[PDB]
């Protein structure tokens, strides 16, 4: 019976000097003014940003403000500074404490399509009985990209894992790797291994592939 806090949007893409606005909605009314906001930079603990719906603790600049009541609350940053790009959480304390899921504020830049590369498993690894096929998406923006694995046209599901870098400090792009893992026996049953990439920067999806056992 906890109060569930839902933030929107999940991600804000903005530039310094622009306004950020984060919403926090509750599954039940928050009593009195019992809502707080936090900012969290990577590798750091969260930092109290707003309390009592709209109050700033000492040291919080006045570009941060909060509003709302009941089930609907808002955090806003009037004009973003570079240090403001971080994850922001709401928290209620009218009931047993709960947090929103967080809203990431990232740097907005022009769309950049990913450069795609596919890597077959090495002979050495195959000797050990496992095949890792790696697909690389390099230096793209926005972060939203879809990688599908298609093995002889068959759409794979449940046998891949992805990893994404944090936004680059110099060009504000992201990079992503997808790794398809099969046993050696399964790997040798197929021919075409294809990595299909969907991204806003691409006029149509990009497919990179290789035929097993060939140069």
């Amino acid at each position: 019976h906890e109060i569930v806090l839902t933030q929107s949007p999940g991600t804000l893409s903005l530039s310094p000097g622009e306004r950020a606005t984060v919403s926090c909605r509750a599954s039940q009314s928050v009593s009195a003014s019992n809502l707080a906001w936090y900012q969290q930079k990577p590798g750091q603990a969260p930092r109290l940003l707003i309390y009592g719906v709209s109050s700033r603790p000492t040291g919080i600049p006045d570009r941060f403000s909060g509003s709302g009541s009941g089930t609907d609350f808002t955090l806003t940053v009037s004009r973003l500074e570079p240090e403001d790009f971080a994850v922001y959480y709401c928290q209620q304390y009218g009931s047993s404490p709960t947090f929103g899921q967080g809203t990431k504020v990232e740097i907005k830049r022009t769309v950049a399509a990913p450069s795609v590369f596919i890597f077959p498993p090495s002979d050495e690894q195959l000797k050990s009985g496992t095949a890792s096929v790696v697909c690389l998406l390099n230096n793209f923006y926005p972060r939203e990209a879809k990688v599908q694995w298609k093995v002889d046209n068959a759409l794979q599901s449940g046998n891949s894992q992805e990893s994404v870098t944090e936004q680059d400090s110099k060009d504000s792009t992201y990079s992503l790797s997808s790794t398809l893992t099969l046993s050696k026996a399964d790997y040798e049953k197929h021919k075409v291994y294809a990595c299909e990439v969907t991204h806003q920067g691409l006029s149509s999806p990009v497919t990179k592939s290789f035929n097993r056992g060939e140069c």
Binding site: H1, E2, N34, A36, Y38, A45, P46, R47, L48, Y51, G52, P57, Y89, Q91, Y93, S96, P97, T98, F99, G100, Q101, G102, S115, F117, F119, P120, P121, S122, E124, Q125, S128, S132, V134, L136, N138, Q161, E162, S163, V164, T165, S175, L176, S177, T179, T181, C215
Partner: protein, 225 residues
């Protein structure tokens, strides 16, 4: 007021996690004191709180597993989490919660938000044994212009591994991805770099992989196949 925390780091499933937080520059009697965790890449979850007289409130989903305690003479408070599983892997924070107030007609604790916060302690729960990685080449293919190559660093435990290229002399265009936790309980990552395709015949690329927990060091030269 400043908080310092410490405790276990690596645990195996079914163990008891124990952590302690020390308060400096203030007394425990003025506030409720909380524990809050954050699984890697996830959000924040309140665990429970305790005040100076030992009164406690718990996250209802964790209440049966949580034991909180307070040492008023040392100005410390502690968290015990029993029967840990891999799902308990998280950074655990201690934090000062709401103050105790004495109003004319009412006394108790109010404004239960969190300030300040401890620096956090990463606790990892796993049944895996310490294991160094295997390093495999991600070979460059074959106008063009740009080529990609890398190293796959597979099946190690625990975190972390470091990767450099050419003993640190190659940094531009390198991406070393965050590790992923495989279903086996072992970690895996890749480190890639983009290079001019024209120089593939005369340039050498070596990834330097170091796994301090297993005292492992591997240099892998990555060549076209």
């Amino acid at each position: 007021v400043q908080l310092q925390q410490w405790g276990a780091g690596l645990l195996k499933p079914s163990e008891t996690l124990s952590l302690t937080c020390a308060v400096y520059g203030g007394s425990l009697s003025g506030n409720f004191w909380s524990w809050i965790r954050q699984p890697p890449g996830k959000g924040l979850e309140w665990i429970g709180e305790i005040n100076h007289s030992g009164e406690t409130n718990h996250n209802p989903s964790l209440k049966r597993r949580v034991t909180l305690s307070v040492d008023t003479s040392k100005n410390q408070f502690s968290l015990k989490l029993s029967s840990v599983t891999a799902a308990d892997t998280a950074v655990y924070y201690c934090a000062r919660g709401g103050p105790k107030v004495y109003y004319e007609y009412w006394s108790g604790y109010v404004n239960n938000c969190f300030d300040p916060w401890g620096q956090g302690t990463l606790v990892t729960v796993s049944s895996a044994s310490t294991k160094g990685p295997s390093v495999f080449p991600l070979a460059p293919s074959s106008s063009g212009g740009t080529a990609a190559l890398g190293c796959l660093v597979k099946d190690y435990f625990p975190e972390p591994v470091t990767v450099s290229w050419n003993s640190g002399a190659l940094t531009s265009g390198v991406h070393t991805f965050p590790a992923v936790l495989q279903s086996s309980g072992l970690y895996s990552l890749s480190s890639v770099v983009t290079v001019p395709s024209s120089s593939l015949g005369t340039q050498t690329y070596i990834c330097n992989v170091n796994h301090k927990p297993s005292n492992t060091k591997v240099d892998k030269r990555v060549e076209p196949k």
